[PDB]
Each structure stands twice: as C-alpha cells, then as structure tokens.
Amino acid sequence: HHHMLHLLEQIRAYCETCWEWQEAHEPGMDQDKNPMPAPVEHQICPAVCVLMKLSFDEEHRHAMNELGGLQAIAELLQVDCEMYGLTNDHYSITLRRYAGMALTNLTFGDVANKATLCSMKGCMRALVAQLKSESEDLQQVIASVLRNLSWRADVNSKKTLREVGSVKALMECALEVKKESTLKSVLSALWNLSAHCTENKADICAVDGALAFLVGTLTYRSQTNTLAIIESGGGILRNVSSLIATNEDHRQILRENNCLQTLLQHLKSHSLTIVSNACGTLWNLSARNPKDQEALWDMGAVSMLKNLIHSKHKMIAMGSAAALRNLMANRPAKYKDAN
Amino acid sequence: YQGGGEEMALP
C-alpha cells in the first residue's frame, strides 16, 4: 500500500502548509502577504477521492488505520472548513463530501476510530457547522458521521457530541432537508443522541417546530417503500416522551396532530420496532395526565395494550404493560359513574 | 434506546 501512503503524505503535507499559514496570519496582526493555500492547486480532491473509494474495503481500511488515515482525513476536512467556511465552491464541497464519506466508512464498526474522531474537538465543531451547508449531499455525509459517532458512544464521546451542539444542529437540519436519504441519516443520529442524556432530550424539544415535525414522521410516506423514517422519527419521539409527558404545551402540540391516535395504530404495525417505539411513547404519555388518559380510554387503548403484554420483546412487554397499568390506575369518572 | 445504529457511506 505504498501509493495509499503517498496519498496520505500528500494530504498531511497540504495540512502542514495550511496550519503554518493559519499560525502566521491572524487577522488584525502583523503578517506577510503570502497567499492562503488553495486545495485545487495541490490535487487534494483527487487524493481524498481515491481514499474514499478505497475505504469501502475492510482490507484497505486496515492499511489506512495502520497509517493514521482517519486523523489525516479528519485534519484535512477540519482545516478546509476553518479556512473557507460555508462555501458553495464545488471543489471545496466535493473534497469535504469525500473526506466525510471516508470518515463514515472508517468509523463504521470501529470503536477506536470513533473515540479518536470525537477527541478531535476542532474537527467535531467543523462537522457540526457543515449541517448548515446548502449542499444537501454534504449534510447527508456529515449526518452519517455523526450517526456513527453517536452509536455506542463512550462517556467521553457522549460529552463531546453534546458540547459541540450536535443535537440542536441536527434537529434544525431535519426541519429543512428534502431527500429521504438525508433525513434517514439525520434522524438516525438523533435517535442515538436522544438516548444519551436528559439534556439532549430537552434540546430536541426546545427547537421550534421539532415536536410537530417528529409527530409528522409517524405518518411519513416513504417513496422507497421502507419504514426507516417512521422507525427513526418514532424512536426519537419515544426517547423524548418522558419530557413531553410533563409539559402541557408539548402535549398540546401532539394533540393537534392526533399523536395518541397514531400511536394506537402503531400498536397494530407488523414492525416490532414501530410497535416498540409506540409502546414506549404511550408508557410516558399515559402517566399523570387526566386528559390524555381519558382520550386513550375513549380510543380503546386498554384492549390494544392488553393484546401486547405477553409479547416477549422486553420493550413491547414493558411499555404495553406500563401503559395499561397507568390507564387502569386512572379509570375516568364517566366510566366509574356508568359502572 | 439508541436504535439509530451506524451505516457506511452511500456510494
């Protein structure tokens, strides 16, 4: 893998020229007139393109990992982001896409690489900033990296992902993306992030229009005939539902979109993931709210939940039974008065 | 739960 080593050296050298330049040219401070490096003049995009293509293969990934390929690619992505900012320049967008694709491939299934990339704080900030790119393809690539980093995140990674503002940035991104594949990556990352801590759940719920959008995903209609968006949107909803349950304003947003009625339809889904997410959401929404308790009674929820308590899937079993016992502990007056 | 998983890059 001598050519690969050569390509990594090409990009490390280019980064070195960039860092030296950044160090020696602080705006407002005395400095020479030597020009800022441009990646187009050093064949950078072709190099990262070749690396991105090789990174699909586990054998080339092994050879990259021995050579420190992840750090070299991350450093290039970071430095181009710092030098040029949010640009629509095709060359810059293309190099950042290819760098991100490689980072996605190099983090997949790879505990050590995820840890390394999260430790690159400057790179993590650069990644989060790219979610505002006008290139939806770049947004998809960045969300893919964040999805992988957020999966099985260690304590340090969880903290870094939170501190760089990935949650708010991804939720805001979700509200505007057009393609299903971008949305899949963005919601998958959010499904992972929303399980990490209470603060991430709050941050999602705080974004203007986020809850309505998540409720909307429960009835998303895939043009590719998959259930990935309903599963991920519903998975985020389940994870933040513990907070929704104690916020009347947020419950009202759900009501305006007939959320409870949709979750009951989800109990009859042929997808266990969809059923599980619905059971988890109902577990929370069925607690400590007379209005939504009565609504669930009225919509026949008791029988639907009772149907699931023998399931044998931990979360369907747990959630269905917890929702059922909430409803049974809170039989509405109009049922009690009617005997 | 973290149901989001992980995935390779889209070609």
Residues whose CB is less than 8 angstroms from the CB of residue A263 and which lie 6 or more positions away in sequence, other chains included: A218, A278, A281, A282, A285
> In the structure encoding, which two tokens stand for residue A150, read together?
């957020």
Cβ–Cβ of A151/B6 closer than 8 Å?
yes
**Would you call A157 an interface residue with chain B, using a CB distance cutoff of 8 Å?**
no
Domains of chain A (ranges plus CATH)?
1-339 (1.25.10.10)
**Would you call A140 an interface residue with chain B, using a CB distance cutoff of 8 Å?**
yes
Cβ–Cβ of A231/B5 closer than 8 Å?
no
Angle (CA) A70 A114 A120, round 5°: 65
Please report the number of interchain residue pairs, chain A to chain B, with beta-carbon separation below 8 angstroms. 67
HEC assignment per residue over chain A: CHHHHHHHHHHHHHHHHHHHHHHHCCCCCCCCCCCCCCHHHHCHHHHHHHHHHHCCCHHHHHHHHHHCHHHHHHHHHHHHHHHHCCCCCHHHHHHHHHHHHHHHHHHCCCHHHHHHHHCCHHHHHHHHHHHHCCCHHHHHHHHHHHHHHHCCCCHHHHHHHHHCCHHHHHHHHHCCCCCHHHHHHHHHHHHHHCCCCHHHHHHHHHCCCHHHHHHHHCCCCCCCCCCHHHHHHHHHHHHHHHHHCCCHHHHHHHHHCCHHHHHHHHCCCCCHHHHHHHHHHHHHHCCCCHHHHHHHHHCCHHHHHHCCCCCCCHHHHHHHHHHHHHHHCCCCHHHHHHC
**Would you call A104 an interface residue with chain B, using a CB distance cutoff of 8 Å?**
yes
Cβ–Cβ of A189/B11 closer than 8 Å?
no
Chain B residues near residue A273 by CB distance under 8 angstroms: 3
- In this structure, are residues A269 and A278 in contact, taking their beta carbons and an 8 Å threshold? yes
What does the DSSP 8-state code read for residue B5?
-
Task: Identify the experimental approach.
Answer: X-ray
